[PDB]
């Protein structure tokens, strides 16, 4: 049931009208998700997905979009009783959420490719029966605010989503799954992620979003991708300005990825008169800082790879030894892949071909190159020695024979007489992780000692018998 206020933008007709559509919500008491995300979801379609008869911009008439809510809500409160679930002191049980939850996932078809684009948004489960797993966490929170269950809020770490709800918002509920091949706990409590201090669970200090944080949500997940080559402007340029809003009104101050979002866009195509890309990405890392214990992975990551794009070897490779320095207080735990294959990555390719082009540059005569700074070497130093410290009481191991090749050869980029000015104190560096301590007099030699790396970083016990 929408309300006459909420209809008198419509029809929409531009990128601009759907902004204000989105002003006048986010200046309501409760802006209503289920609208926003049938919005975003009917342009996206005919933006992204399919293009025939586009001229400038899909018109979003309110009769289609009144009848997709109309669509919604009828699902929603035809299979929800509410009287079956008495609410006390305006908040909802965990059978409520659960059964929320059970609508939902019913709703979906029994198989698809989960992975898809475009797979985000309520005009998908609508249109399609389809969601992407936190798609389907979202859908619950805007199923729960059209029953009136102001309590139920979005949860989301750097890899996951799940709800928070219940006296105080201090119940948590799975509400979806994780990643693929995972046995799903649906309904359960994430206190066992939080306290074994896996990276999916951020430790406890995950976001616990508001409604406007929920809105920030549904515009990071805006997908301009028409195909792998080709992404839609007016899409960037949508996403570009709601996140411009957002960011205005207070709602992204919570929001460390919406911020490293915003400046990656930002790099794309700036905005006149607006903040840098590194001004963005430094707030992300200050908002992780103020709100989130500093303990989230993805603000250093953003800046790693903006330095990396416009190769600035030095402030990359500071970036990601601060993220190492991050994820070495963590447990490396079953359900974390997705955080071992990006330091994996950056270990054994990125940074590896930035300092093969670093070291062509230097032999054509470059002057302030990384390869020449030692602060650069103990930047490098440091990232490893995060990731051996991580390693440090997890229940699965994640240091082996492929990351030592690539340490080796990343160490002999630098010479001997650059190694040698670093200070490894018990530039100066101080090493958290044994397998680094272990290794200090092998660092600063002249001859890099291969073998013997290899031997201290995978702590293999024994070499070649005959
Ligand atoms: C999927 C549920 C967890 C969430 C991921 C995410 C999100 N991402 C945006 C894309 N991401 C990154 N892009 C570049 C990166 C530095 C590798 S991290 C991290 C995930 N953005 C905004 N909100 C959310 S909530």
């Given at each position: 049931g929408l309300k006459a206020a909420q209809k008198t933008l419509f029809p929409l007709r531009s990128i601009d009208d759907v902004v204000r559509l989105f002003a006048a919500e986010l200046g309501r008491e409760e802006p209503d998700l289920v609208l926003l995300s049938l919005v975003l979801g009917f342009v996206e379609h005919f933006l992204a997905v399919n293009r025939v008869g586009l001229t400038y911009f899909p018109v979003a008439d309110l009769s289609i979009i009144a009848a997709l809510y109309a669509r919604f809500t009828a699902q929603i409160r035809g299979a929800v009783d509410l009287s079956l679930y008495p609410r006390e002191g305006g908040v909802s049980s965990r059978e409520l959420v659960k059964k929320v939850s059970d609508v939902i996932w019913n709703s979906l078809s029994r198989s698809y490719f989960k992975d898809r684009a475009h797979i985000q948004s309520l005009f998908s489960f609508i249109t399609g029966t389809?969601?992407?797993?936190?798609?389907?966490?979202?859908?619950?929170?805007?199923?729960?605010?059209?029953?009136?269950?102001?309590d139920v809020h979005l949860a989301?770490?750097?890899?996951?989503?799940?709800?928070?709800?219940?006296?105080?918002?201090?119940?948590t509920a799975e509400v979806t799954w994780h990643g693929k091949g995972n046995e799903d706990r649906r309904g359960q409590?994430?206190?066992?992620?939080?306290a074994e201090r896996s990276w999916?669970?951020?430790?406890?200090?995950?976001?616990?979003?508001?409604?406007?944080?929920?809105?920030?949500?549904?515009?990071?997940?805006?997908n301009p991708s028409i195909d792998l080559h080709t992404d839609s402007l007016e899409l960037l340029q949508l996403q570009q300005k709601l996140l411009w809003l957002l960011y205005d009104l207070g709602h992204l101050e919570r929001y460390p990825?919406?911020?490293?979002?915003?400046?990656?866009?930002?790099?794309?195509?700036?905005?006149?008169?607006r903040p840098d890309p590194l001004t963005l990405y430094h707030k992300g890392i200050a908002?992780?800082?103020?709100?989130?214990?500093?303990?989230?992975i993805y603000p250093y990551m953003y800046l790693a790879?903006?330095?990396?794009?416009?190769?600035?070897?030095?402030?990359?490779?500071?970036?990601?030894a601060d993220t190492a320095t991050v994820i070495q207080d963590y447990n490396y735990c079953r359900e974390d892949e997705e955080i071992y294959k990006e330091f994996f990555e950056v270990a054994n390719d990125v940074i590896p071909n930035l300092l093969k082009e670093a070291a062509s540059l230097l032999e054509a005569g470059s002057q302030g190159s990384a390869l020449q700074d030692p602060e650069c070497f103990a930047h490098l130093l440091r990232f490893y020695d995060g990731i051996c410290k991580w390693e440090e009481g997890s229940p699965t191991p994640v240091l082996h024979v492929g990351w030592a090749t690539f340490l080796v050869q990343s160490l002999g980029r630098f010479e001997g007489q650059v190694r040698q000015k670093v200070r490894i104190?018990?530039?100066?560096?101080?090493?958290?992780?044994?397998?680094?301590?272990?290794?200090?007099?092998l660092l600063v030699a002249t001859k890099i000692n291969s073998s013997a790396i290899k031997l201290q970083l995978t702590a293999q016990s024994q070499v070649q018998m005959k």
């Open positions: 389809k969601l992407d797993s936190s798609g389907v966490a979202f859908a619950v929170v805007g199923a729960c605010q059209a029953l009136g269950l102001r989301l770490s750097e890899d996951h989503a799940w709800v928070v709800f219940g006296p105080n918002g201090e119940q409590t994430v206190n066992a992620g939080v999916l669970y951020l430790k406890g200090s995950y976001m616990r979003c508001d409604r406007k944080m929920e809105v920030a949500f549904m515009v990071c997940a805006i990825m919406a911020l490293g979002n915003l400046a990656d866009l930002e790099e794309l195509e700036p905005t006149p008169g908002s992780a800082k103020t709100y989130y214990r500093d303990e989230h790879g903006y330095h990396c794009r416009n190769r600035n070897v030095r402030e990359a490779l500071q970036a990601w104190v018990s530039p100066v560096l101080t090493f958290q992780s044994e397998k680094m301590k272990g290794m200090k007099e």
